Amino acid sequence: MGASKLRAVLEKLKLSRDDISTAAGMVKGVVDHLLLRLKCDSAFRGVGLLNTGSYYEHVKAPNEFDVMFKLEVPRIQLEEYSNTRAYYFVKFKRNPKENPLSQFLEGEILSASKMLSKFRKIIKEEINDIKDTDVIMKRKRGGSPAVTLLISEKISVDITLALESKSSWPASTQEGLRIQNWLSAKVRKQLRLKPFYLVPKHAKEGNGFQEETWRLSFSHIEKEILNNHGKSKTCCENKEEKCCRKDCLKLMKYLLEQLKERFKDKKHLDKFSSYHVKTAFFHVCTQNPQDSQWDRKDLGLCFDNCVTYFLQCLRTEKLENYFIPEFNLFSSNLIDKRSKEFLTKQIEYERNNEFPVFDE
Ligand SMILES: Nc1nc2c(ncn2[C@@H]2O[C@@H]3COP(=O)(O)O[C@@H]4[C@H](O)[C@@H](COP(=O)(O)O[C@@H]2[C@@H]3O)O[C@H]4n2cnc3c(N)ncnc32)c(=O)[nH]1
Ligand SMILES: [Zn+2]
């Protein structure tokens, strides 16, 4: 693929500051309004907007946003559920002292369902026109911890609750984050000396669910390594060190989004998220630690590489969580072979025909 073609697509993706600010004002207003009322309850007293920039993950739909609320939970003990390596139960260490979240305690185990119930409840109470904006709450999609709300029948904002743990990272993440040769073991060291988050998501057990398990979240680390991607510290700070990592990620994400949009009727792509793309991209970054391997004039090649790798995952049904190596994202239990074969077919067609889906 021509670097000028792909860079033409990326040039098109770049939107004006007005379209990204006009909405961000109202969204920021609603969020800042909710944050105040969240502190009225003793449970959500230690809550706070996790500084991620208050931006979205989509590229072109920018009408949607994504915010994440962190909540510090001191002295927590995780319990690995059914050896899923990624889902845990929350058991507080010392309970003779009064605990704010005791109302959600299902014994020794913290109930995620009641937590999200109270959270979504308070939010649903504040959404009853208290502001000057017209905001309505969307239905629960099922299993989804996010609480989406709609402003002016145009802007969608998903609110997610997290559990901040300043303790040491779980043992499942021991062999994770293989950035030693890429961003140095020093950066890995200092990064692993950061808190890890927890999101209320139930894992699959077959003909049922738990609704009381929590998944490991490392979105902040992803943002960090994303905004600081080069092996060189001055990467993308001068004309001689401009790379194309971010460009590749944007291209992959946009490809997946366009394919998911084109086949919205069918359900073959509904089990694929941009996170699989991001993960695959991180794996490629590990496989290509040198900035020279990411020259901006090689955008075509680099991108192709990513595509190839992604395809390989789909072809092998293997996509390890970048932080939890044993946790496979493309396992047969999660996503079926049919969907992955479909996506391989579509993507392969796109690559073989100069990506006509970009011009849609
Ligand atoms: N707005 C919003 N929606 C989410 C989020 N995480 C999941 N969802 C959606 O809620 C359902 C939960 O599905 P699973 O978590 O069990 O696995 C989902 C699902 O298989 C796919 C996401 O598909 P989506 O269309 O975006 O909808 C999901 C899904 O309907 O990737 C998985 N996934 C998404 N984010 C991650 C992630 N960060 N780590 C591991 N797996 C992830 C989220 O963080 N924000
Ligand atoms: Zn760079």
Author numbering: 160 to 219, 222 to 521
Paper text:
Activated STING causes the activation of TBK1, which phosphorylates IRF3 allowing it to translocate to the nucleus where it triggers interferon‐inducible gene activation and interferon production. We report here the structure of cGAS with dinucleotides and small molecule inhibitors, and kinetic studies of the cGAS mechanism.
To study the β‐pseudo‐active form we obtained structures of an N‐terminal truncation of cGAS starting at residue 161 (cGAS161)22 in complex with five cyclic dinucleotides (2′,2′‐cGAMP, 2′,3′‐cGAMP, 3′,3′‐cGAMP, 3′,3′‐cdIMP and 3′,3′‐cdUMP), and the linear 2′,5′‐GpAp dinucleotide. There is no interaction between Asp227 and 3′,3′‐cdUMP or 2′,2′‐cGAMP; in these structures cGAS retains an inactive pose. 2′,2′‐cGAMP contains an amino group on its guanine base; however, 2′,2′‐cGAMP is considerably displaced from the active site compared with 2′,3′‐cGAMP or 3′,3′‐cGAMP with its amino group interacting with Asp319 (2.9 Å) instead of Asp227. Each compound binds to the same site formed between the side chains of Tyr436 and Arg376. This site is occupied by the adenine base in structures of ATP, 2′,2′‐cGAMP, 2′,3′‐cGAMP, or 3′,3′‐cGAMP, and is composed primarily of London dispersion interactions between the ring system of these binders with the phenyl ring of Try436. Most of these dinucleotides have affinities weaker than 500 μM (the top concentration tested).
